[PDB]
Amino acid sequence: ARIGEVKRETKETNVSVKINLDGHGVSDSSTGIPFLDHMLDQLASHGLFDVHVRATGDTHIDDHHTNEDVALAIGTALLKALGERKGINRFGDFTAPLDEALIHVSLDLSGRPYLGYNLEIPTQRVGTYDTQLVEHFFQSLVNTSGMTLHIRQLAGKNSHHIIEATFKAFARALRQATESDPRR
Amino acid sequence: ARIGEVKRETKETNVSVKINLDGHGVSDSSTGIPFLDHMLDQLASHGLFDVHVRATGDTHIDDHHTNEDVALAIGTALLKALGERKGINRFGDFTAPLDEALIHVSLDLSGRPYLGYNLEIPTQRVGTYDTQLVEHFFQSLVNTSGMTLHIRQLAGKNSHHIIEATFKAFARALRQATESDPRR
Amino acid sequence: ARIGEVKRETKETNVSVKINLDGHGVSDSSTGIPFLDHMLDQLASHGLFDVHVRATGDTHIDDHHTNEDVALAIGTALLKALGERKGINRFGDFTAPLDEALIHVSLDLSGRPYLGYNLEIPTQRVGTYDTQLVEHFFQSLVNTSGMTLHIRQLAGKNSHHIIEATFKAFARALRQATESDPRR
Amino acid sequence: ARIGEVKRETKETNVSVKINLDGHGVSDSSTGIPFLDHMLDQLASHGLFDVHVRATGDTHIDDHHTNEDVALAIGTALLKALGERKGINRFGDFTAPLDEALIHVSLDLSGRPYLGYNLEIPTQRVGTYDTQLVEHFFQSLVNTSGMTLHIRQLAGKNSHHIIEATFKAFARALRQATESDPRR
Amino acid sequence: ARIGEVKRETKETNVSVKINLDGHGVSDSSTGIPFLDHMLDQLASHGLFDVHVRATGDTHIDDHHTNEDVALAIGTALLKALGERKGINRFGDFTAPLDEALIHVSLDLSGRPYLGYNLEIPTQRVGTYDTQLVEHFFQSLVNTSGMTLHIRQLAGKNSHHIIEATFKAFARALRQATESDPRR
Amino acid sequence: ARIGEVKRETKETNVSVKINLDGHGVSDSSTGIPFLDHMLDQLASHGLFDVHVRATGDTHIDDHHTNEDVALAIGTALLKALGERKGINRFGDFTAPLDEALIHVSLDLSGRPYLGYNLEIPTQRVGTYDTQLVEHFFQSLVNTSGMTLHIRQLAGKNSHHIIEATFKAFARALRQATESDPRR
Ligand SMILES: [Cl-]
Ligand SMILES: [Cl-]
Ligand SMILES: [Mn+2]
Ligand SMILES: [Mn+2]
Ligand SMILES: [Mn+2]
Ligand SMILES: [Mn+2]
Ligand SMILES: [Mn+2]
Ligand SMILES: [Mn+2]
Ligand SMILES: [Mn+2]
Ligand SMILES: [Mn+2]
Ligand SMILES: [Mn+2]
Ligand SMILES: [Mn+2]
Ligand SMILES: [Mn+2]
Ligand SMILES: [Mn+2]
């Protein structure tokens, strides 16, 4: 099994991540941001990744630093887990709904960071989670993983549905990309 | 094999449906609506479903009641055939052409009915079939199956091509969703 | 292995093509048009086709006749390699990025030629290659192969990225379409 | 005399075509689509082709499959009749009226299929014939004959006049293209 | 030779017309309207018709009645000359320039009168000739000959050029239509 | 046979032209501009002219002077070959396609130079040939031949197709104009 682990401490946050690319969907995420924990559970269940995350940090300032540092660490953990990338599909492409929401994700484990993102989340807070932080989560993850990632909102009105459908589609695309190509 | 069967009688229609999710594309549909029979044949052949349908009803009023009651029964038959949904992909996503027509279908066997539909069929009758009835077929099927279904017209000009490409894409997406996930 | 071979001589060009549908990505293309050679290498590597091409011709007039005659011959070679089409997926659908570029390709090995193409390539020359020739390459290939092909630009700014992403997506869609359907 | 004959059977249609390029306008067409029979009579009379067509098929679904399969077979019959194309004009260009309708047709027996078509037929049914099927007739004929064909509506309001003028102009252009060039 | 002759007297005009369809371009027209005489000379020379016209009438009121009655008589003379129409092309199509002017004429000797006319003559008088009378000349000729006639201005700025190019194109189209079809 | 020959030397260019109006399509053109050579070959083959051209000149400055001086000399050669114009059609009118391109040419060998030209060539270079030079070629040819020439782009997207279709249509119109009128 391909397992990547990262521990990172700043003056703002303390983060530990462990991801198994060849998992069974074991979800074990506690970031101090409940909505992000919910999305990381989606990542595990829809991607069949095992996801272990612990974070503490300066959430009294806002969720930003924690969200960013968790994302950065996940990207690095993914990079480590991938190793030499031998024999993998490398590309993933999936479009997933959640009720009225429909989100397309296309990615390439390319070594060149890029985020294309056009979500229009119509409310500012989902629970206590600042919806600007969704883009920053994916941007930071891309930057440390060296992923080419396109996220396209095809439909959606409920903010929780839009974000959750994004994580479902991303997880399924990433599962595809990380799985073995039977002809390689 | 996962087989669902439904018999339903109203004062307007008499309907019998049997669907095998694990079929070989056996097509055996006679609804009293020839264009709908043609589309149900597409469902079987493109989905590798075995599809048996018989309907009679008040087509002298219009095809509406028959079309609706057939769709409702198909949705219920699908629901029955699925049973506990164990180990299935659950999600399907396919884009199929028919010449100049190009139709994207994304679905989730979620238990929550939703239809997203944006087809713009530029003629009122294909053969003797009222083209408004395409949307109603999918809406009714969604309602009894508890499916999340998005149908997106990406291209198309000929009405028969648009509708037929929709059924090809839907069938292929539904095949995917109903098939076993090798890691589940 | 399914191998198609075509030799074609005009007063303008001399072309030889050999394609293995069941290949390992062996790339061996020399057309007299370096950018086209680069794209044919992408076809091989991303499609797992073995691609052997030799062409000479009137490139001092412009690359047009060579580009066209190579494309025509590739389409015929594909047609020959496919034979009776027994047991194949027939349909392919893939969306691939290259950095900021994102290209969707959907195809059906239908026997009816059709090209849907909406690329907007913002420069006139990539290297010494006239970017109008990309459309003509796909049109000519479609015409002799009898393929239904839709190419959709979803994002992109760099001309080389747009064209190369197109070839990646086309190759992956064509691989899918030509591969065996495990239930057929 | 240059005679081409085609017999083609599908699960949808049974078609037989025989065309003499060097005819006297003998019209003998029975397709199961009366309006199409009327247009094929125009082809014979205005083109001085001898045209023999028989078709049966699934017209209870709609006229589409019959219309398409007849057109495909006519294109192949034309291709066969043309043989090596020695000494022919190859190009045809004619503009014909029918009362207020005025239709320009330009064609080249090039070996490269292309349809340019801009008819705007303002009603959905002429008799029982779906007017979308006019474009599909010419597209399918082009595809199997390998013809470059441009059809331009210059004037017209009555749907029957527009379609019939198209067939008159096409027939006269095709007569020209297929006739001997006295200097070749 | 096919010769038609008409004499017609009203309280406004006295008209005599003789036209030979199989002529040598003999021009012999004196209508009392010099510009119309010039156009009738063009008809003869460009059409290879022999044209004999004499008219007198109420030109002190305006040229209208003479222009109309001459046109009516020419249409009848053409009708008479045509006789049974056996073996003729029947259709004519020609586009002729005169310097910057370019005029397309398409006609069918159909037995159903129709004029399609879109000339935009930018001055009110050419010499002493009222330029509204050009349309009325063709309308009246169509009405008595039973001709389908389309006149299309493709280019032009000088009024004399526009009108004269119209007569050149009409004459050449009419020559074609009235000539023998070698296969009929 | 009607043969015109012109030799012309400037400080910029050396040009020799010989054209046979009553030719067999013998193509023998070497101008120092490969794309122009290709178009002159089209002139010969589509017009059944014999075309002999030799030019050298200052192509390191740009192709302009050579293109212009070749065109001027061709116009003069045509003028010389025509002689007294006895018995010729004088007018030509043809519309030719090349795939998606469709070009109408109408001309009159009038003795009055005029070019009407509306081509919109969407790229700046076809091969190494500056596409502005197409208009200048026809303008210069018109000026020395004393031709009335209208060139109308009816359709087209590929620059090579647009230009080549223009030369096909021009050649066929010029063949018509230069041929004998059987009634003159
Ligand atoms: Cl899309
Ligand atoms: Cl036009
Ligand atoms: Mn930040
Ligand atoms: Mn949720
Ligand atoms: Mn209803
Ligand atoms: Mn069908
Ligand atoms: Mn080409
Ligand atoms: Mn590259
Ligand atoms: Mn069709
Ligand atoms: Mn009719
Ligand atoms: Mn009046
Ligand atoms: Mn004049
Ligand atoms: Mn100049
Ligand atoms: Mn060429």
UniProtKB/Swiss-Prot annotation, chains A, B, C, D, E, F:
Pathway(s) per entry: Amino-acid biosynthesis; L-histidine biosynthesis; L-histidine from 5-phospho-alpha-D-ribose 1-diphosphate: step 6/9
Record comment: activity regulation: Weakly inhibited by inorganic phosphate (Pi). Competitive inhibition by 2-hydroxy-3-(1,2,4-triazol-1-yl) (e.g. C348), a potential herbicide.
GO biological process terms held by the UniProt record: L-histidine biosynthetic process
Chain residues that bind Mn(2+) 1: H38, H65, H160, E164
Main location per the UniProt record: plastid
Residues binding substrate: 12, 38-46, 64-68, 90, 112, 160-168
Cofactor: Mn(2+)
EC category name: lyase
Protein EC: 4.2.1.19
Tree of life domain: Eukaryota
Keyword Ribonucleoprotein in annotation: no
Keywords: Amino-acid biosynthesis, Chloroplast, Histidine biosynthesis, Lyase, Manganese, Metal-binding, Plastid, Transit peptide
GO cellular component term, pick one: chloroplast
Free-text cofactor note: Binds 2 manganese ions per subunit. Substrate binding triggers a switch in the coordination state of the Mn(2+) active site between six- and five-coordinate species; this switch is critical to prime the active site for catalysis, by facilitating the formation of a high-energy imidazolate intermediate.
Catalytic activity: D-erythro-1-(imidazol-4-yl)glycerol 3-phosphate = 3-(imidazol-4-yl)-2-oxopropyl phosphate + H2O
Gene Ontology molecular function: imidazoleglycerol-phosphate dehydratase activity; metal ion binding
Family listed: Belongs to the imidazoleglycerol-phosphate dehydratase family.
Protein name per UniProt: Imidazoleglycerol-phosphate dehydratase 2, chloroplastic
Species, as recorded: Arabidopsis thaliana (Mouse-ear cress)
Gene (UniProt): HISN5B
Residues of the full protein shown: 75 to 258 of 272
